[PDB]
């Protein structure tokens, strides 16, 4: 109360101070039971790939991925690549390719190449890439004979989308079959290096899911119900307690939404119960006191919670289950208002003093000493 | 194989307030959401059809059949019909639902006797063979095909039904659960049945959809439909 | 010619360490990719399912073995594991391998319907002894 | 979450009528969607006698089918064969819970 009224002499009254709030006790984590891990040996290396224009789908499914083994062979898009390792998601899809020195940055969300033409890597990319340099290790000539080059088309292509016709295509004033003329060209032309392929392993990460397969190499905890605790299911943190929602969900829904933009329930990866995300109890802080001139004895109100969400056993809270990082009082009593610590509440009535709401009032008065 | 059929004008009916399908997986109970996506105008013009012919498919389609028993027994849907893009068939073979996605190669009118909707199957890259689609002029059937980028969604509903037979698709309302969820990659524009039949598109319009205490719609409303509805 | 062949023993204690493998005998249909799932039947009772998973994962639990248990498939050894590790007193039972229904090719697609068609001969399981 | 009710035994005269049914809740069979019927002879594994709430599989005889509508589904057996005298079980396809609740079972036994 001093340190809010900037003062060292404090009146009489009911002064709002702080907020009161709960700590997450336990810090529990919820990933489904697997035990498998990725085969990261067929990712980094192979010696066969596809074309820059036609690129396959050597997709890694249900394996648990481990990205502190990244570099045993980067750029890194949508996530940070400090915190891919505790993300949640169903299916790992890779967009593995090769690549030119002049086509480094040209196969990317952002910058024009073969593949803005014939196969296209999206502009909405969640995954991360590692870009290896081969010319070193892999030292020929030509890289392969599917692996060829263009300039342009008459038109370009959505991502994923597969076109490899080999026409003249015509961006001029004439259609053009076999046909040399203004802007009929046929650009394709294969690769011929000089002092060597190069590159590139990808690993999209999709949306939208479904419950998933796949975590990070976080190890899942016990399950803590009706208790604020520090929750991660499957990639969403948060603090709360965990209630049981009652709710009916269809099998293939994992997450139940309020009003606002949140998550209000949530499927449990492992015993596909439904879990309320509620947070834990929190109110207002009021301070009764009446006044530095009179006493220093004061009363604490605590908006808006039960005599049961509030630290009551002073002796114990060194162990910091709240925010407060005190805890002081003697006597306890519930009100409307909230529950009040540091008055003992009497039978009689007496004119309004220190308001407290709901028709309770707080006073300095002789019962034979001051309280 | 191809057979000679004859063709006839095409008739138009009303829609009423009827083709409101789920939008998203996430259960909502007992609010009133209001969304923007692709859904049937109300009080629309839905064209009605006693032959096959090959229809447009303009960003999701709403399909109804009005029948006795099982004559409409699949779909068919496309770019170009021949053997040069991909192409999904759908058919409600008896006690059987066959759903390809492959080259194909159709004959001009596709129809179920026996089999003469194609010739060959080449390159075949989805195949699913289920519990058929159909089920139960008392039988009334409601889909809606909506390809969004990567999935062809499906929406069905099954309705016992006793109004007149002639221009009388009915009044009311009923949500559309989904039905079925296809991984497919293919582009679709244009659409075929295999032998009443009603036809109406989709258009990305603003609803409000009144979400009971079971999860269930029970009430959609068009802002765009009516001032008072707006 | 479709047969599922079983294997598993017969007689444990509880809290003990079991498993039941379940087999295809060399037929196409009900081998690689097909819906799958265990079912329990207790001596002198009904049936009562227990265990299926689609696709790769998907894997959808009885209430009574929603955390007690695990379910693995191997596809290209066209094997179909459900583990037994400490079983409760009234999983004395006969056991049944079953295909559900629906050939899928290629992809992980979503259907909200299920089946079982095919069935195993039944491996019965002692563990109240 | 199942609901379902199922009489326990029925009298299968042979060549006579007998119906049998089975009724849940609205989610899983008011829905008119994925209810089998499973014969099981004793010693002898439950194949899937007939599902789709009518469909009849490979291999079932005519004349033995069902009459599912709505929350209640039935079969009608017309002209019971002694290698009929069986147990039948339903299985419903909920979206609550997913639990694949099965029934009771219906054991007929002839006379």
């Known amino acids: 109360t001093k340190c809010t009224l900037k003062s060292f002499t404090v009146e009489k009254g009911i002064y709002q101070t702080s907020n009161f709030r709960v700590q997450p006790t336990e810090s529990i984590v919820r990933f489904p039971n697997i035990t498998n891990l990725c085969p990261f040996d067929e990712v980094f290396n192979a010696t066969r790939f596809a074309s820059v224009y036609a690129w396959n789908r050597k997709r890694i499914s249900n394996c648990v991925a481990d990205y502190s083994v990244l570099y045993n062979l980067f750029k890194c898009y949508g996530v940070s690549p400090t915190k891919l390792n505790d993300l949640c998601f169903t299916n790992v899809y890779a967009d593995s390719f090769v690549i030119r020195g002049d086509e480094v940055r040209q196969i990317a969300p952002g910058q024009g190449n073969i593949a803005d033409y014939n196969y296209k890597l999206p502009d909405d990319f969640t995954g991360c890439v590692i870009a290896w340099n081969s010319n070193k290790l892999d030292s020929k000539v030509s890289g392969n004979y599917n692996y060829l080059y263009r300039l342009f088309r008459k038109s370009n292509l959505k991502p994923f989308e597969r076109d490899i016709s080999t026409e003249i295509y015509q961006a001029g004033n004439k259609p053009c079959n076999g046909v040399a003329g203004f802007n009929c060209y046929f650009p394709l032309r294969s690769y011929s290096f000089r002092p060597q392929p190069y590159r590139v392993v990808v690993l999209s990460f999709e949306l939208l899911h479904a419950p998933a397969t796949v975590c990070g190499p976080k190890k899942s905890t016990n399950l803590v119900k009706n208790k604020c605790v520090n929750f991660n299911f499957n990639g969403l943190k948060g603090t709360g307690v965990l209630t049981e929602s009652n709710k009916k969900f269809l099998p293939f829904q994992q997450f139940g939404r309020d009003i606002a933009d949140t998550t209000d329930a949530v499927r449990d990866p492992q015993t596909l119960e439904i879990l309320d995300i509620t947070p834990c109890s929190f109110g207002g802080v009021s301070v009764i006191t009446p006044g530095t001139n009179t006493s220093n004895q004061v009363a604490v109100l605590y908006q808006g919670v039960n005599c049961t969400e509030v630290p009551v056993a002073i002796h114990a809270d060194q162990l910091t289950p709240t925010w407060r990082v005190y805890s002081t009082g003697s006597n306890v009593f519930q009100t409307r208002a909230g529950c009040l610590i540091g008055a003992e509440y009497v039978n009689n009535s007496y004119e309004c003093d220190i308001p407290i709401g709901a028709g309770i009032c707080a006073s300095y008065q002789t019962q034979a000493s001051q309280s | 194989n191809l057979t000679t059929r004859t063709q006839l004008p095409p008739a138009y009916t009303n829609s009423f307030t009827r083709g409101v399908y789920y939008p998203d997986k996430v259960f909502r109970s007992s609010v009133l959401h209001s969304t923007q996506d692709l859904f049937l105008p109300f009080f629309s013009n839905v064209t009605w059809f006693h032959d096959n012919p090959v229809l447009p498919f303009n960003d999701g389609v709403y399909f109804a059949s009005i029948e006795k028993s099982n004559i409409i027994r699949g779909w068919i849907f496309g770019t170009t019909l021949d053997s040069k893009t991909q192409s999904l068939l759908i058919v409600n073979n008896a006690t059987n639902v066959v759903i390809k996605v492959c080259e194909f190669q159709f004959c001009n009118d596709p129809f179920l006797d026996e089999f003469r909707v194609y010739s060959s199957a080449n390159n075949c890259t989805f195949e699913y063979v289920s519990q058929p689609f159909l089920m139960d002029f008392k039988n009334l059937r409601e889909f809606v095909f909506k390809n969004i980028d990567g999935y062809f969604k499906i929406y069905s509903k099954h309705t016992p039904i006793l109004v007149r037979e002639p221009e009388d698709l009915p009044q009311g309302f009923s949500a559309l659960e989904p039905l079925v969820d296809l991984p497919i990659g293919i582009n679709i524009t244009r659409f075929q049945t295999l032998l009443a039949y009603y036809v109406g598109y989709l258009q990305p319009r603003t609803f409000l959809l009144k979400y009971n205490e079971n999860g269930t719609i029970t009430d959609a409303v068009d802002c765009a439909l009516d001032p008072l509805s707006e | 010619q479709v047969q599922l062949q079983e294997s598993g023993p017969g007689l444990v204690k509880p809290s003990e360490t079991l498993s039941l493998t379940c087999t295809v005998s060399?037929?196409?249909?009900?081998?690689?990719?097909?819906?799958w799932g265990w079912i329990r039947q207790p001596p002198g009772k009904g049936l009562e399912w227990i265990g299926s998973?689609?696709?790769?994962?998907?894997?959808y639990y009885n209430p009574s073995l929603k955390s007690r248990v695990t379910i693995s498939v191997d596809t290209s050894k066209n094997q179909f594991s459900l583990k037994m590790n400490s079983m409760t007193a009234a999983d004395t039972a006969v056991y049944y391998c079953a295909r559900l229904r629906g050939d899928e090719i290629y992809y992980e697609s979503s259907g909200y319907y299920s089946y079982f068609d095919y069935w195993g001969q039944g491996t019965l399981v002692t563990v109240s002894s | 979450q199942s609901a379902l009710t199922q009489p326990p035994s029925v009298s299968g005269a042979p060549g006579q009528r007998v119906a049998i049914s089975c009724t849940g809740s609205?989610?899983?069979?008011?829905?008119?969607?994925?209810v089998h019927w499973y014969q099981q002879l004793p010693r002898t594994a439950p194949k899937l006698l007939i599902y789709?709430?009518?469909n009849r599989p490979s291999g079932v005889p005519d004349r033995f089918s069902g009459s599912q509508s709505g929350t209640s589904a039935s079969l009608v057996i017309t002209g019971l064969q002694p290698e009929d005298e069986a147990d039948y079980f339903c299985?419903?396809?909920?979206?609550?819970?997913?639990?694949?609740?099965f029934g009771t079972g219906t054991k007929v036994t002839v006379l």
């Open positions: 060399g037929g196409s249909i009900s081998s690689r990719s097909y819906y």
């Open positions: 789709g709430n009518n």
């Open positions: 299985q419903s396809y909920d979206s609550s819970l997913s639990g694949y609740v």
């Open positions: 998973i689609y696709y790769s994962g998907s894997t």
């Open positions: 609205s989610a899983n069979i008011g829905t008119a969607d994925d």
